[PDB]
Design a protein around this ligand. Sequence first.
Ligand SMILES: O=C(O)[C@@H]1O[C@@H](O[C@H]2[C@H](O)[C@H](O)[C@H](O[C@H]3[C@H](O)[C@H](O)[C@H](O[C@H]4[C@H](O)[C@H](O)[C@H](O[C@H]5[C@H](O)[C@H](O)[C@H](O[C@H]6[C@H](O)[C@H](O)[C@H](O)O[C@H]6C(=O)O)O[C@H]5C(=O)O)O[C@H]4C(=O)O)O[C@H]3C(=O)O)O[C@H]2C(=O)O)[C@@H](O)[C@@H](O)[C@@H]1O
Ligand SMILES: [Ca+2]
Length: 496
Amino acid sequence: SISEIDRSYLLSSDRLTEVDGNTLDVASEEQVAALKAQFENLKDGDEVVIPNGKYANLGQVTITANDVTIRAEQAGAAWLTGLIQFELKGDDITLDGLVFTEGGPNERFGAVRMMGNGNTLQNSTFYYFNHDYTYEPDERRSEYPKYLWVSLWGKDGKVINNRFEGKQKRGTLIGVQKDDTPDNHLIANNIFMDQKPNQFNEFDIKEAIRYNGNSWEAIRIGDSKSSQWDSSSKFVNNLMIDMDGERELISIASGDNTISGNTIFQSAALISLRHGKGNTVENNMILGNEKRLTGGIRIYDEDHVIRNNYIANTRGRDGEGNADLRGGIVINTGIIDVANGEQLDQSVKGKELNKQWTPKNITIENNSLVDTEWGIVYGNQSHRVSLFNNAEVEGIYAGVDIAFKHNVVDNSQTPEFVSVRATHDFPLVGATYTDETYVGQVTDSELIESYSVELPKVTVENGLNAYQGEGADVSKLSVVTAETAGPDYVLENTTK
Ligand SMILES: O=C(O)[C@@H]1O[C@@H](O[C@H]2[C@H](O)[C@H](O)[C@H](O[C@H]3[C@H](O)[C@H](O)[C@H](O[C@H]4[C@H](O)[C@H](O)[C@H](O[C@H]5[C@H](O)[C@H](O)[C@H](O[C@H]6[C@H](O)[C@H](O)[C@H](O)O[C@H]6C(=O)O)O[C@H]5C(=O)O)O[C@H]4C(=O)O)O[C@H]3C(=O)O)O[C@H]2C(=O)O)[C@@H](O)[C@@H](O)[C@@H]1O
Ligand SMILES: [Ca+2]
Protein backbone atom coordinates (compact mmCIF):
# COMPACT_ATOMS: atom_id res chain seq x y z
CA SER A 1 0.00 0.00 0.00
CA ILE A 2 1.39 3.19 -1.42
CA SER A 3 2.23 5.32 1.66
CA GLU A 4 3.74 2.26 3.39
CA ILE A 5 6.07 1.29 0.42
CA ASP A 6 9.79 1.42 1.13
CA ARG A 7 13.24 0.72 -0.29
CA SER A 8 13.17 -2.76 1.28
CA TYR A 9 9.96 -3.69 -0.52
CA LEU A 10 10.98 -2.41 -4.04
CA LEU A 11 14.41 -4.04 -3.96
CA SER A 12 13.45 -7.45 -2.45
CA SER A 13 13.19 -10.39 -4.67
CA ASP A 14 13.71 -14.10 -4.21
CA ARG A 15 14.88 -14.60 -7.77
CA LEU A 16 18.12 -12.91 -6.80
CA THR A 17 21.20 -15.05 -6.36
CA GLU A 18 23.51 -13.32 -4.09
CA VAL A 19 27.15 -12.86 -5.33
CA ASP A 20 29.74 -12.15 -2.68
CA GLY A 21 32.94 -10.11 -3.27
CA ASN A 22 35.07 -12.39 -1.18
CA THR A 23 34.63 -15.68 -3.03
CA LEU A 24 36.45 -13.74 -5.74
CA ASP A 25 40.21 -13.42 -5.90
CA VAL A 26 42.22 -10.40 -7.11
CA ALA A 27 43.76 -11.20 -10.54
CA SER A 28 47.51 -10.52 -10.73
CA GLU A 29 48.91 -7.74 -12.96
CA GLU A 30 49.65 -10.65 -15.35
CA GLN A 31 46.17 -12.18 -15.73
CA VAL A 32 44.70 -8.69 -16.37
CA ALA A 33 46.87 -8.33 -19.52
CA ALA A 34 45.95 -11.93 -20.50
CA LEU A 35 42.28 -10.93 -20.12
CA LYS A 36 42.96 -7.70 -22.06
CA ALA A 37 44.54 -9.51 -25.09
CA GLN A 38 41.56 -11.90 -25.15
CA PHE A 39 39.38 -8.74 -25.37
CA GLU A 40 41.39 -7.09 -28.10
CA ASN A 41 41.83 -10.16 -30.30
CA LEU A 42 38.26 -11.54 -30.36
CA LYS A 43 36.71 -12.13 -33.87
CA ASP A 44 33.15 -11.72 -35.28
CA GLY A 45 30.97 -14.24 -33.45
CA ASP A 46 33.47 -15.05 -30.70
CA GLU A 47 32.59 -14.73 -27.01
CA VAL A 48 34.76 -14.04 -23.96
CA VAL A 49 33.55 -15.66 -20.79
CA ILE A 50 35.45 -13.82 -18.08
CA PRO A 51 36.38 -16.38 -15.43
CA ASN A 52 35.30 -15.22 -11.94
CA GLY A 53 37.44 -12.74 -9.87
CA LYS A 54 38.43 -9.02 -9.44
CA TYR A 55 40.38 -7.42 -12.30
CA ALA A 56 41.87 -3.95 -11.54
CA ASN A 57 42.80 -1.38 -14.28
CA LEU A 58 42.06 -2.97 -17.58
CA GLY A 59 42.28 0.67 -18.79
CA GLN A 60 41.26 1.18 -22.34
CA VAL A 61 39.55 -1.89 -23.84
CA THR A 62 38.62 -1.40 -27.54
CA ILE A 63 36.28 -4.07 -29.08
CA THR A 64 36.42 -3.79 -32.87
CA ALA A 65 34.71 -7.16 -33.60
CA ASN A 66 31.07 -7.64 -34.56
CA ASP A 67 28.53 -10.08 -33.22
CA VAL A 68 30.43 -10.78 -30.00
CA THR A 69 29.41 -11.31 -26.37
CA ILE A 70 31.51 -10.55 -23.37
CA ARG A 71 29.97 -12.13 -20.24
CA ALA A 72 31.01 -13.06 -16.70
CA GLU A 73 31.35 -16.86 -16.17
CA GLN A 74 28.81 -16.58 -13.42
CA ALA A 75 26.60 -13.40 -13.46
CA GLY A 76 27.96 -10.71 -11.14
CA ALA A 77 31.17 -12.54 -10.39
CA ALA A 78 33.60 -10.63 -12.71
CA TRP A 79 34.39 -7.33 -11.03
CA LEU A 80 36.10 -4.68 -13.07
CA THR A 81 37.91 -2.26 -10.86
CA GLY A 82 40.34 0.75 -10.96
CA LEU A 83 40.29 2.59 -14.36
CA ILE A 84 38.46 0.92 -17.25
CA GLN A 85 36.50 1.86 -20.33
CA PHE A 86 35.07 -0.61 -22.71
CA GLU A 87 34.90 1.08 -26.07
CA LEU A 88 32.41 -0.79 -28.20
CA LYS A 89 33.12 -0.01 -31.81
CA GLY A 90 31.72 -3.25 -33.26
CA ASP A 91 28.05 -3.91 -34.13
CA ASP A 92 25.91 -6.42 -32.16
CA ILE A 93 28.26 -6.40 -29.21
CA THR A 94 26.73 -7.55 -25.86
CA LEU A 95 28.17 -7.00 -22.39
CA ASP A 96 26.45 -9.17 -19.82
CA GLY A 97 26.77 -9.78 -16.11
CA LEU A 98 29.68 -7.42 -15.38
CA VAL A 99 30.37 -5.39 -12.23
CA PHE A 100 32.02 -1.92 -12.31
CA THR A 101 33.09 -0.80 -8.84
CA GLU A 102 36.02 0.50 -6.70
CA GLY A 103 37.33 2.57 -9.63
CA GLY A 104 36.11 5.01 -12.27
CA PRO A 105 35.79 5.50 -16.05
CA ASN A 106 39.09 5.62 -17.96
CA GLU A 107 37.72 8.42 -20.08
CA ARG A 108 34.85 10.77 -19.14
CA PHE A 109 32.16 9.18 -21.36
CA GLY A 110 32.04 6.22 -19.00
CA ALA A 111 32.88 2.58 -18.22
CA VAL A 112 30.96 1.62 -21.29
CA ARG A 113 31.02 3.56 -24.55
CA MET A 114 28.44 1.97 -26.87
CA MET A 115 29.56 3.29 -30.29
CA GLY A 116 28.27 0.59 -32.56
CA ASN A 117 24.85 -0.50 -33.73
CA GLY A 118 22.74 -2.90 -31.83
CA ASN A 119 25.07 -2.74 -28.79
CA THR A 120 23.73 -4.14 -25.49
CA LEU A 121 24.55 -3.70 -21.88
CA GLN A 122 22.56 -6.25 -19.77
CA ASN A 123 22.52 -7.76 -16.26
CA SER A 124 25.38 -5.51 -15.10
CA THR A 125 26.05 -3.67 -11.88
CA PHE A 126 27.69 -0.25 -11.24
CA TYR A 127 28.44 0.37 -7.60
CA TYR A 128 29.80 3.74 -6.42
CA PHE A 129 32.15 3.91 -9.52
CA ASN A 130 33.35 7.35 -8.46
CA HIS A 131 37.08 6.87 -7.88
CA ASP A 132 40.63 6.99 -9.17
CA TYR A 133 40.14 9.70 -11.85
CA THR A 134 41.27 13.24 -11.18
CA TYR A 135 38.48 15.37 -9.71
CA GLU A 136 39.36 18.98 -9.13
CA PRO A 137 37.86 22.43 -9.77
CA ASP A 138 39.54 23.36 -13.08
CA GLU A 139 41.91 26.45 -13.33
CA ARG A 140 39.61 28.25 -15.85
CA ARG A 141 36.37 28.53 -13.80
CA SER A 142 36.59 26.04 -10.97
CA GLU A 143 34.39 23.51 -12.83
CA TYR A 144 34.60 19.86 -11.70
CA PRO A 145 34.77 17.36 -14.60
CA LYS A 146 31.59 15.67 -15.89
CA TYR A 147 32.04 11.93 -15.80
CA LEU A 148 29.30 9.65 -17.13
CA TRP A 149 28.97 5.92 -16.51
CA VAL A 150 27.41 4.70 -19.77
CA SER A 151 27.13 6.47 -23.14
CA LEU A 152 25.38 5.50 -26.30
CA TRP A 153 26.68 6.85 -29.60
CA GLY A 154 25.26 4.32 -32.07
CA LYS A 155 21.84 2.95 -33.04
CA ASP A 156 19.43 0.49 -31.52
CA GLY A 157 21.35 0.35 -28.26
CA LYS A 158 19.92 -1.54 -25.31
CA VAL A 159 20.58 -0.91 -21.63
CA ILE A 160 18.41 -3.48 -19.78
CA ASN A 161 18.34 -5.11 -16.34
CA ASN A 162 21.26 -3.31 -14.86
CA ARG A 163 21.76 -1.76 -11.53
CA PHE A 164 23.24 1.76 -11.28
CA GLU A 165 23.97 2.55 -7.71
CA GLY A 166 25.62 5.50 -5.90
CA LYS A 167 26.70 7.96 -8.62
CA GLN A 168 28.09 10.71 -6.41
CA LYS A 169 30.46 12.80 -8.49
CA ARG A 170 29.42 15.29 -11.25
CA GLY A 171 28.21 13.95 -14.60
CA THR A 172 25.08 12.38 -16.12
CA LEU A 173 24.89 8.65 -15.32
CA ILE A 174 23.73 7.46 -18.91
CA GLY A 175 24.20 9.91 -21.85
CA VAL A 176 22.81 9.51 -25.33
CA GLN A 177 25.19 11.15 -27.85
CA LYS A 178 23.11 11.12 -31.00
CA ASP A 179 23.08 12.43 -34.58
CA ASP A 180 20.41 13.66 -37.05
CA THR A 181 18.41 10.43 -37.43
CA PRO A 182 16.35 8.31 -34.96
CA ASP A 183 18.37 6.26 -32.48
CA ASN A 184 15.66 3.91 -31.18
CA HIS A 185 17.54 3.05 -27.97
CA LEU A 186 15.82 1.05 -25.22
CA ILE A 187 16.69 1.80 -21.63
CA ALA A 188 14.44 -0.51 -19.64
CA ASN A 189 13.99 -2.63 -16.52
CA ASN A 190 16.91 -1.00 -14.77
CA ILE A 191 17.44 -0.14 -11.23
CA PHE A 192 18.87 3.34 -10.31
CA MET A 193 19.72 4.37 -6.72
CA ASP A 194 21.39 6.95 -4.55
CA GLN A 195 22.65 9.48 -7.05
CA LYS A 196 23.50 12.47 -4.97
CA PRO A 197 25.55 15.73 -5.37
CA ASN A 198 27.99 17.72 -3.17
CA GLN A 199 29.50 14.72 -1.43
CA PHE A 200 32.94 16.23 -1.97
CA ASN A 201 32.41 19.92 -1.18
CA GLU A 202 31.87 20.82 -4.76
CA PHE A 203 29.27 23.38 -3.80
CA ASP A 204 31.71 25.16 -1.45
CA ILE A 205 32.87 27.29 -4.38
CA LYS A 206 29.91 29.71 -4.24
CA GLU A 207 30.75 31.48 -7.58
CA ALA A 208 30.74 28.23 -9.56
CA ILE A 209 27.55 26.66 -8.13
CA ARG A 210 25.20 27.19 -11.10
CA TYR A 211 27.32 24.91 -13.24
CA ASN A 212 28.92 22.66 -10.66
CA GLY A 213 25.37 21.94 -9.35
CA ASN A 214 24.31 20.99 -12.87
CA SER A 215 24.82 17.75 -14.91
CA TRP A 216 23.87 15.20 -12.25
CA GLU A 217 20.96 13.65 -14.21
CA ALA A 218 20.34 9.92 -14.23
CA ILE A 219 19.97 10.02 -17.99
CA ARG A 220 20.13 12.62 -20.72
CA ILE A 221 18.62 11.66 -24.12
CA GLY A 222 20.12 13.99 -26.82
CA ASP A 223 21.62 17.41 -26.04
CA SER A 224 21.14 21.04 -27.02
CA LYS A 225 22.83 20.76 -30.51
CA SER A 226 20.96 17.56 -31.39
CA SER A 227 17.70 18.51 -29.74
CA GLN A 228 15.66 19.44 -32.77
CA TRP A 229 15.97 15.87 -34.21
CA ASP A 230 14.12 12.70 -33.17
CA SER A 231 15.79 10.13 -30.97
CA SER A 232 12.65 7.94 -30.73
CA SER A 233 14.31 6.29 -27.71
CA LYS A 234 12.53 4.70 -24.72
CA PHE A 235 13.11 5.11 -21.00
CA VAL A 236 10.64 2.55 -19.62
CA ASN A 237 9.88 0.27 -16.70
CA ASN A 238 12.76 1.50 -14.61
CA LEU A 239 12.92 1.71 -10.86
CA MET A 240 14.51 4.81 -9.31
CA ILE A 241 15.13 5.22 -5.58
CA ASP A 242 16.54 8.33 -3.74
CA MET A 243 17.84 9.72 -7.07
CA ASP A 244 18.58 13.25 -5.91
CA GLY A 245 21.24 14.38 -8.46
CA GLU A 246 19.67 17.78 -9.31
CA ARG A 247 16.43 19.26 -10.54
CA GLU A 248 16.43 17.02 -13.66
CA LEU A 249 16.14 13.31 -12.95
CA ILE A 250 15.85 12.55 -16.68
CA SER A 251 16.71 15.35 -19.14
CA ILE A 252 15.11 14.70 -22.53
CA ALA A 253 16.91 16.82 -25.13
CA SER A 254 15.65 15.32 -28.50
CA GLY A 255 12.33 14.37 -30.09
CA ASP A 256 9.74 11.54 -30.15
CA ASN A 257 10.89 9.88 -26.97
CA THR A 258 8.87 7.71 -24.46
CA ILE A 259 9.44 8.05 -20.77
CA SER A 260 6.75 5.73 -19.41
CA GLY A 261 5.94 3.34 -16.64
CA ASN A 262 8.85 4.10 -14.32
CA THR A 263 8.60 3.99 -10.60
CA ILE A 264 10.33 7.02 -9.09
CA PHE A 265 10.51 6.69 -5.34
CA GLN A 266 11.66 9.38 -2.91
CA SER A 267 13.74 10.99 -5.66
CA ALA A 268 14.43 14.77 -5.20
CA ALA A 269 14.60 15.27 -9.06
CA LEU A 270 11.93 15.60 -11.80
CA ILE A 271 11.29 14.15 -15.22
CA SER A 272 12.38 17.11 -17.38
CA LEU A 273 11.32 17.64 -21.00
CA ARG A 274 14.22 20.08 -21.47
CA HIS A 275 14.61 20.47 -25.26
CA GLY A 276 13.00 18.81 -28.29
CA LYS A 277 9.55 17.99 -29.49
CA GLY A 278 6.73 15.46 -29.23
CA ASN A 279 7.84 13.52 -26.22
CA THR A 280 5.38 11.26 -24.34
CA VAL A 281 5.34 10.73 -20.57
CA GLU A 282 2.75 8.13 -19.51
CA ASN A 283 1.85 5.68 -16.75
CA ASN A 284 4.63 6.66 -14.40
CA MET A 285 4.41 6.23 -10.70
CA ILE A 286 6.08 9.00 -8.83
CA LEU A 287 6.01 8.36 -5.16
CA GLY A 288 7.62 11.22 -3.28
CA ASN A 289 6.91 9.62 0.12
CA GLU A 290 6.92 13.15 1.61
CA LYS A 291 10.64 13.80 0.85
CA ARG A 292 11.43 17.51 0.34
CA LEU A 293 12.30 18.55 -3.30
CA THR A 294 10.36 15.72 -4.91
CA GLY A 295 8.07 16.48 -7.89
CA GLY A 296 6.68 15.02 -11.16
CA ILE A 297 7.38 16.43 -14.61
CA ARG A 298 8.63 19.83 -15.85
CA ILE A 299 8.05 20.88 -19.45
CA TYR A 300 9.67 23.06 -22.12
CA ASP A 301 9.24 22.99 -25.91
CA GLU A 302 6.38 21.69 -28.05
CA ASP A 303 3.93 18.92 -28.83
CA HIS A 304 4.31 16.72 -25.69
CA VAL A 305 1.77 14.24 -24.30
CA ILE A 306 1.62 13.76 -20.59
CA ARG A 307 -1.03 11.20 -19.65
CA ASN A 308 -2.06 8.73 -16.96
CA ASN A 309 0.69 9.46 -14.48
CA TYR A 310 0.24 8.87 -10.76
CA ILE A 311 2.14 11.42 -8.65
CA ALA A 312 1.79 11.26 -4.92
CA ASN A 313 3.08 12.73 -1.68
CA THR A 314 5.53 15.16 -3.25
CA ARG A 315 6.90 18.21 -1.34
CA GLY A 316 8.76 21.39 -2.36
CA ARG A 317 11.60 23.27 -0.59
CA ASP A 318 11.62 24.45 3.03
CA GLY A 319 10.60 28.14 3.53
CA GLU A 320 10.70 33.87 -3.37
CA GLY A 321 7.59 35.02 -5.39
CA ASN A 322 9.38 33.97 -8.54
CA ALA A 323 10.79 30.63 -7.36
CA ASP A 324 11.13 27.73 -9.82
CA LEU A 325 8.73 25.51 -7.76
CA ARG A 326 8.98 21.72 -8.06
CA GLY A 327 5.45 20.57 -8.70
CA GLY A 328 3.70 17.40 -9.87
CA ILE A 329 3.44 18.92 -13.36
CA VAL A 330 5.27 22.24 -14.07
CA ILE A 331 4.50 24.25 -17.27
CA ASN A 332 7.75 26.27 -17.47
CA THR A 333 8.09 29.81 -18.71
CA GLY A 334 10.60 30.25 -21.60
CA ILE A 335 12.33 33.08 -23.44
CA ILE A 336 10.68 33.00 -26.86
CA ASP A 337 7.32 34.21 -28.11
CA VAL A 338 5.92 30.87 -29.33
CA ALA A 339 2.37 32.27 -29.43
CA ASN A 340 3.72 34.23 -32.52
CA GLY A 341 5.81 31.32 -33.81
CA GLU A 342 9.22 32.30 -32.43
CA GLN A 343 11.81 29.43 -32.21
CA LEU A 344 15.15 28.91 -30.60
CA ASP A 345 17.86 29.15 -33.24
CA GLN A 346 21.60 28.62 -32.96
CA SER A 347 22.06 31.91 -35.02
CA VAL A 348 20.02 34.25 -32.85
CA LYS A 349 22.12 35.57 -29.93
CA GLY A 350 20.37 34.92 -26.60
CA LYS A 351 17.95 32.43 -28.24
CA GLU A 352 20.29 29.47 -28.95
CA LEU A 353 19.15 25.79 -28.85
CA ASN A 354 20.44 25.38 -25.24
CA LYS A 355 18.12 28.02 -23.92
CA GLN A 356 14.47 27.83 -22.89
CA TRP A 357 11.76 26.95 -25.41
CA THR A 358 8.42 28.28 -24.07
CA PRO A 359 6.10 25.24 -23.94
CA LYS A 360 3.48 25.03 -26.67
CA ASN A 361 0.79 22.60 -27.78
CA ILE A 362 0.98 20.29 -24.67
CA THR A 363 -1.61 17.58 -23.96
CA ILE A 364 -2.05 16.99 -20.19
CA GLU A 365 -4.78 14.39 -19.40
CA ASN A 366 -5.96 11.78 -17.04
CA ASN A 367 -3.18 12.40 -14.49
CA SER A 368 -3.76 11.76 -10.78
CA LEU A 369 -1.86 13.95 -8.41
CA VAL A 370 -2.48 12.90 -4.81
CA ASP A 371 -1.37 14.86 -1.76
CA THR A 372 1.11 16.92 -3.79
CA GLU A 373 2.30 20.14 -1.98
CA TRP A 374 2.49 21.85 -5.36
CA GLY A 375 0.21 20.09 -7.92
CA ILE A 376 0.04 21.62 -11.42
CA VAL A 377 2.32 24.69 -11.41
CA TYR A 378 2.06 27.40 -14.10
CA GLY A 379 5.59 28.75 -13.99
CA ASN A 380 6.57 32.30 -13.30
CA GLN A 381 10.29 31.68 -13.03
CA SER A 382 12.86 33.87 -14.74
CA HIS A 383 15.97 32.39 -16.49
CA ARG A 384 19.64 33.35 -16.72
CA VAL A 385 21.47 33.90 -20.00
CA SER A 386 23.52 30.72 -19.49
CA LEU A 387 25.16 28.53 -16.82
CA PHE A 388 28.16 31.00 -17.04
CA ASN A 389 26.35 34.27 -17.40
CA ASN A 390 24.23 35.09 -14.32
CA ALA A 391 22.33 37.97 -15.88
CA GLU A 392 18.55 37.46 -15.89
CA VAL A 393 16.88 37.29 -19.24
CA GLU A 394 14.45 40.08 -19.89
CA GLY A 395 11.67 38.68 -22.09
CA ILE A 396 9.77 35.74 -20.41
CA TYR A 397 6.70 34.11 -21.83
CA ALA A 398 3.98 31.73 -20.50
CA GLY A 399 2.98 28.35 -22.00
CA VAL A 400 0.70 28.33 -25.07
CA ASP A 401 -2.05 25.95 -26.19
CA ILE A 402 -1.99 23.83 -23.04
CA ALA A 403 -4.92 21.44 -23.01
CA PHE A 404 -5.96 20.01 -19.64
CA LYS A 405 -8.52 17.14 -19.58
CA HIS A 406 -9.74 14.65 -16.95
CA ASN A 407 -6.97 15.41 -14.41
CA VAL A 408 -7.58 14.91 -10.69
CA VAL A 409 -5.50 16.89 -8.23
CA ASP A 410 -6.61 15.50 -4.85
CA ASN A 411 -5.37 17.47 -1.86
CA SER A 412 -8.42 16.46 0.20
CA GLN A 413 -6.02 15.29 2.98
CA THR A 414 -4.22 18.63 3.31
CA PRO A 415 -6.30 21.17 1.40
CA GLU A 416 -3.90 24.05 2.27
CA PHE A 417 -1.58 22.45 -0.27
CA VAL A 418 -1.74 24.21 -3.66
CA SER A 419 -3.42 21.89 -6.20
CA VAL A 420 -3.06 24.33 -9.11
CA ARG A 421 -0.74 27.30 -9.00
CA ALA A 422 -2.04 29.69 -11.66
CA THR A 423 -0.35 33.10 -11.91
CA HIS A 424 -1.36 36.48 -13.25
CA ASP A 425 2.40 37.16 -13.70
CA PHE A 426 2.36 34.86 -16.77
CA PRO A 427 -1.12 33.82 -17.77
CA LEU A 428 -1.21 30.80 -20.07
CA VAL A 429 -2.22 31.58 -23.61
CA GLY A 430 -4.97 29.50 -25.15
CA ALA A 431 -5.24 27.15 -22.16
CA THR A 432 -8.33 24.88 -22.14
CA TYR A 433 -10.00 22.78 -19.36
CA THR A 434 -12.22 19.77 -19.93
CA ASP A 435 -13.56 17.91 -16.86
CA GLU A 436 -10.78 18.93 -14.50
CA THR A 437 -11.11 18.16 -10.74
CA TYR A 438 -8.99 20.17 -8.33
CA VAL A 439 -9.35 19.73 -4.58
CA GLY A 440 -7.21 22.01 -2.48
CA GLN A 441 -5.92 25.55 -2.92
CA VAL A 442 -6.03 27.02 -6.41
CA THR A 443 -3.99 30.26 -6.72
CA ASP A 444 -5.32 32.87 -9.26
CA SER A 445 -8.17 30.61 -9.93
CA GLU A 446 -10.01 33.25 -11.96
CA LEU A 447 -7.50 32.36 -14.75
CA ILE A 448 -9.20 28.98 -15.09
CA GLU A 449 -12.41 28.63 -17.08
CA SER A 450 -13.93 25.79 -14.99
CA TYR A 451 -13.26 22.74 -12.91
CA SER A 452 -15.02 20.68 -10.32
CA VAL A 453 -14.14 20.88 -6.60
CA GLU A 454 -15.85 17.61 -5.69
CA LEU A 455 -13.99 14.29 -6.11
CA PRO A 456 -15.74 11.54 -8.05
CA LYS A 457 -16.32 8.40 -5.94
CA VAL A 458 -12.93 7.08 -4.89
CA THR A 459 -11.96 3.38 -4.60
CA VAL A 460 -8.64 1.74 -3.80
CA GLU A 461 -7.29 -0.76 -6.36
CA ASN A 462 -3.93 -2.47 -5.52
CA GLY A 463 -3.09 0.54 -3.25
CA LEU A 464 -3.84 3.30 -5.75
CA ASN A 465 -6.69 5.79 -5.60
CA ALA A 466 -9.09 5.22 -8.50
CA TYR A 467 -11.35 8.25 -9.15
CA GLN A 468 -14.48 7.10 -11.02
CA GLY A 469 -14.40 8.29 -14.64
CA GLU A 470 -11.41 10.67 -14.22
CA GLY A 471 -7.70 10.84 -13.43
CA ALA A 472 -5.17 8.10 -14.05
CA ASP A 473 -6.66 4.75 -15.00
CA VAL A 474 -5.20 2.37 -12.38
CA SER A 475 -5.45 -0.50 -14.87
CA LYS A 476 -2.48 1.03 -16.65
CA LEU A 477 -0.31 1.56 -13.54
CA SER A 478 1.89 -0.70 -11.52
CA VAL A 479 4.88 -0.41 -9.27
CA VAL A 480 8.24 -1.63 -10.68
CA THR A 481 10.18 -3.68 -8.06
CA ALA A 482 13.31 -5.86 -8.17
CA GLU A 483 10.99 -8.70 -9.47
CA THR A 484 11.40 -7.43 -13.04
CA ALA A 485 13.91 -4.54 -12.81
CA GLY A 486 17.64 -4.78 -12.28
CA PRO A 487 20.14 -7.69 -12.46
CA ASP A 488 19.39 -11.31 -11.37
CA TYR A 489 21.84 -11.01 -8.50
CA VAL A 490 22.76 -8.70 -5.67
CA LEU A 491 26.36 -8.02 -4.72
CA GLU A 492 27.61 -8.49 -1.13
CA ASN A 493 30.88 -7.20 0.38
CA THR A 494 31.20 -4.19 -1.97
CA THR A 495 32.85 -0.93 -1.00
CA LYS A 496 31.57 2.63 -1.63
O1 LIG B 1 15.77 27.26 -7.20
C1 LIG B 1 15.04 28.05 -7.81
O2 LIG B 1 13.84 28.29 -7.56
C2 LIG B 1 15.65 28.79 -8.98
O3 LIG B 1 17.03 28.49 -9.01
C3 LIG B 1 17.73 29.11 -10.11
O4 LIG B 1 17.23 28.68 -11.40
C4 LIG B 1 17.75 27.34 -11.66
C5 LIG B 1 16.48 26.59 -12.11
O5 LIG B 1 15.69 26.14 -11.00
C6 LIG B 1 16.77 25.42 -13.03
O6 LIG B 1 17.72 24.54 -12.39
C7 LIG B 1 17.44 26.06 -14.28
O7 LIG B 1 18.33 25.14 -14.92
C8 LIG B 1 18.77 25.58 -16.25
C9 LIG B 1 20.27 25.52 -16.29
O8 LIG B 1 20.87 26.71 -15.67
C10 LIG B 1 20.75 25.35 -17.76
O9 LIG B 1 20.15 26.37 -18.57
C11 LIG B 1 20.29 23.96 -18.22
O10 LIG B 1 20.28 23.94 -19.70
C12 LIG B 1 20.48 22.73 -20.46
C13 LIG B 1 21.27 23.27 -21.64
O11 LIG B 1 21.30 22.34 -22.73
C14 LIG B 1 22.69 23.61 -21.23
O12 LIG B 1 23.53 23.91 -22.36
C15 LIG B 1 23.40 22.46 -20.44
O13 LIG B 1 23.67 21.36 -21.34
C16 LIG B 1 25.08 21.19 -21.55
C17 LIG B 1 25.73 20.53 -20.33
O14 LIG B 1 27.14 20.53 -20.59
C18 LIG B 1 25.19 19.10 -20.17
O15 LIG B 1 26.03 18.35 -19.29
C19 LIG B 1 25.29 18.33 -21.51
O16 LIG B 1 26.63 17.91 -21.85
C20 LIG B 1 26.58 16.86 -22.81
C21 LIG B 1 26.56 17.38 -24.27
O17 LIG B 1 26.48 16.24 -25.15
C22 LIG B 1 27.87 18.19 -24.52
O18 LIG B 1 27.94 18.51 -25.91
C23 LIG B 1 29.20 17.54 -24.12
O19 LIG B 1 29.30 16.52 -25.04
O20 LIG B 1 29.09 16.85 -22.86
C24 LIG B 1 27.89 16.08 -22.59
C25 LIG B 1 27.95 15.65 -21.13
O21 LIG B 1 28.96 15.98 -20.46
O22 LIG B 1 27.01 14.97 -20.68
O23 LIG B 1 24.68 19.07 -22.60
C26 LIG B 1 25.27 20.38 -22.82
C27 LIG B 1 24.58 20.98 -24.03
O24 LIG B 1 24.21 20.12 -24.89
O25 LIG B 1 24.39 22.23 -24.21
O26 LIG B 1 22.58 22.11 -19.32
C28 LIG B 1 21.29 21.61 -19.77
C29 LIG B 1 20.52 20.86 -18.67
O27 LIG B 1 21.14 20.64 -17.61
O28 LIG B 1 19.29 20.53 -18.90
O29 LIG B 1 18.99 23.60 -17.64
C30 LIG B 1 18.11 24.70 -17.34
C31 LIG B 1 16.79 24.11 -16.87
O30 LIG B 1 15.80 24.89 -16.70
O31 LIG B 1 16.74 22.84 -16.63
O32 LIG B 1 18.11 27.32 -14.04
C32 LIG B 1 18.82 27.32 -12.78
C33 LIG B 1 19.65 28.58 -12.69
O33 LIG B 1 20.51 28.57 -11.81
O34 LIG B 1 19.38 29.55 -13.45
C34 LIG B 1 17.57 30.64 -10.04
O35 LIG B 1 18.16 31.35 -11.14
C35 LIG B 1 16.09 31.06 -9.93
O36 LIG B 1 15.36 30.92 -11.17
C36 LIG B 1 15.35 30.29 -8.85
O37 LIG B 1 15.75 30.74 -7.53
CA1 LIG C 1 20.41 19.61 -15.54
